[PDB]
Structures are given as structure tokens and as C-alpha cells.
Amino acid sequence: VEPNLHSLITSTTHKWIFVGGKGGVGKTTSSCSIAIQMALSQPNKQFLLISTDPAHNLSDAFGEKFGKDARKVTGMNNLSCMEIDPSAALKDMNDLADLTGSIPGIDEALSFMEVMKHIKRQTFDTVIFDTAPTGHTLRFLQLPNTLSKLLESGKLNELKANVETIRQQFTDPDLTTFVCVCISEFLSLYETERLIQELISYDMDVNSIIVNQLLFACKRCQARWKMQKKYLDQIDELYEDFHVVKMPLCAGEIRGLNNLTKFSQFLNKEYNPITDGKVIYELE
């Protein structure tokens, strides 16, 4: 099973791609990267990257301002981002809205409504979700089942049909898949294993794991690599049947289309220290 996401990046069937895992592991960095690789690789198709983390970071990552209305990434012809602000969205729908935009769960509700509107309206060929950390993303992926059972007039029936339709698409391995991102450390590895078990139980396809921030080894770096390697061995045993993609810690943060594009190549053809080592240092 190839150690890269080339199969996903060139997929001709996938409509919904979730990128998830523990906090700070690189979900935003990776979902920007997957979205860039897909857009470059399939010029004919139109891609949306939507952040369902209420503390959005797509604008921070690209260095340009996104919002509830999809906008093209400057420099791309076929990649767009969206960051929904619930109180802004509600304030528009209402035309108390504002109080509602502050209720726990409103973020997931509006993100789901965005999915339904792409169902109803059928714009973008593929949607990539840069998700909130693990715990709240599981709640989001359960929404189709949840709404189904709760609902269980013509507009209520309309809501019902649409959620059943999402439930069916989300559980179709050709249409929907979840890419896990993790770091090779105890707290991340165990959280990721719990997440994968839960996803399998939801009948959601999960076939890929990005292991990010690897040192591939300064005494501090030598000790930290020794640790990463121990958990990396475990990841190899556990996830033998998965695409496991090993990504390096770079010499600086990864921001802007240029640097994100440069990092994203290694999701497509896997990082090789022999041939690619200099690249880590171009991010300073």
C-alpha cells in the first residue's frame, strides 16, 4: 500500500474529503496541501476548501482574507476557500439570530447546512474539510445520523431526504473518505487510534494517515527523533493496510501558496531525505 496520497489526489470519484485528527498536528497545513495538489492535478475540476474549525486558520495560512462566501485562492484558477462566521451567516438568514450564533453546536449546524446546500444544488466538484480537532469533528460526522433520528412539512420531508442523501454519500467509500493527520507522540497516536475506530464504526472510509512534523534525525533533535521513531514503528504495525505518509518538520512555518505548494508535493510523491532534504530548509 503506497506511502503517499497519489491515489486520492488523482481520484475521479471523490466529492467529500475530510482532513482530521488531534489539535495542532497539521490538519490545516495538510488540507491546504491536499487541496492544492488536487487542484493542480485536475485543472478541469473546481475545488472548495472549507474550514469547519470555528477558530478558522485558512486565512492565516494563505495570508489572505476568506469569509462565508467562497473566494478563489489568489494564484489558483480552480481552488476556493470558505470560513463561515456563524453570527454573520445568521444575521443574513434572519433578513434572536445573534444569540443563536453563540450557542454551542451552531458551528457544526452551519457547516452541515453548507453541505446540504451543495446537495440540494445538484458548483464545486470536490469539497475538502479542514476540520476542528477530533472530538468536535466526530460530532459533525454524526450529524446526518443524528438529524435523521430526530426528524424520525414538505420542507421537513425535504430536510429529511437531504440528510439521508448525505448519510449515504458520506458512507460511500468512492465518494467520501477521511484522512487522519497525527504526530508521532503518545497523546496523538492514541487519540488517532480512538478516532479511527470511531470512524470505522460510523461506516466512514479511512484509508490514509499523514504522520507530520517528523525529524528524521543536536542532542535535543536526537532524543526527540528517538521518541518519534518508537511511535513510528507502532504506526507501521497498526496501519499496515493504510496509506501512511511521513512528512518532515520544516525549518519554519508553512504559509502562503508558494510554501504550501512546495510542502504539498510530498503528499503526492513521498518525501525522500536522499533527494529532497534541501527542501526542508527552503521554508526558513
Pick one of ligand ALF, ligand ADP, Zn ion, none as the site partner of residue 213 (Cβ within 5 to 8 A by kind): ligand ADP
| Inter-axis angle of helices 256-268 and 27-41, nearest 10 | 80
**In sequence order, what are the beta bridge partners of 208?**
179, 243
Coil, strand or helix: which one is 249? Answer: coil
Q: For the segment 234-253, give every residue that binds Mg ion (CB under 5 A).
A: none
Is the distance from CB of 15 to CB of 172 less than 8 angstroms? no
φ, ψ at 163 (rounded to 5°): -70, -35
| DSSP H helical ranges for 94-218 | 97-100, 106-120, 134-151, 154-170, 186-201
Per-position x/- string for 105-144, each x denoting binding to its own copies as judged by CB under 8 A, each - no binding: xxxxx----------------------xxxxx-xxx-xx-
Binding segment for its own copies (CB under 8 A), chosen from 30-38, 99-107, 117-125, 203-211, is: 99-107
CA gap 8, 205 in Å, rounded: 12
Exactly one of 3, 24, 63, 277 binds ligand ALF (CB under 6 A); which one? 24
Question: Site map for ligand ADP, 248-267, x if CB under 6 A?
Answer: -xx--xx-------------
- Of these, 29, 137, 176, 268, which contacts ligand ADP (CB under 6 A)? 29
Annotated binding site: 22-29, 185, 212, 218, 221, 248-255
**Window 6-35: contact mask with its own copies (x via CB under 8 A):** ----------------xxxx--x-------
Binding residue for Zn ion (CB under 5 A) from 153, 218, 272, 278? 218
Q: How far is the CB of 158 from ligand ADP (least distance, A)?
A: 34
- Binder of ligand ALF out of 3, 23, 75, 277 (CB under 6 A): 23
Exposed/middle/buried for residue 99 (C-beta within 10 Å: 0-12, 13-18, 19+): exposed
Does 98 qualify as catalytic in the annotation?
Answer: no
Of the pair 147, 208, the CB lying nearest Mg ion is at: 208
Q: Which of Zn ion, ligand ALF, ligand ADP, none does residue 212 bind (CB under 5 to 8 Å by kind)?
A: ligand ADP
- Please check whether residue 158 is in contact with residue 117, taking contact to mean a CB–CB distance below 8 angstroms: no
What one-letter code names the amino acid at 233?
D
How far is it, in rounded angstroms, from Cα 37 to Cα 268?
A: 7
Secondary structure string (H, E, C) spanning 50-98: EECCCCCCHHHHHCCCCCCCCEECCCCCCEEEEECCHHHHHHHHCCCHH
Which residues lie closer than 8 Å to 279 by C-beta, 6 or more apart?
250, 262
Contact between 221 and Zn ion by CB under 5 A: the answer reads yes
99 touches which of ligand ALF, Zn ion, its own copies, none (CB within 5 to 8 A by kind)? its own copies
Positions annotated as catalytic residues are 53
Residues that bind Zn ion (CB under 5 A): 218, 221
Q: Kindly list the residues in this chain that would bind ligand ALF in the complex (CB under 6 A).
A: 22-24, 27-28, 53, 55, 57, 133
Q: Which stretches of the chain bind ligand ADP, using CB under 6 A? A: 23-29, 57, 185, 187-188, 212-213, 247, 249-250, 253-254
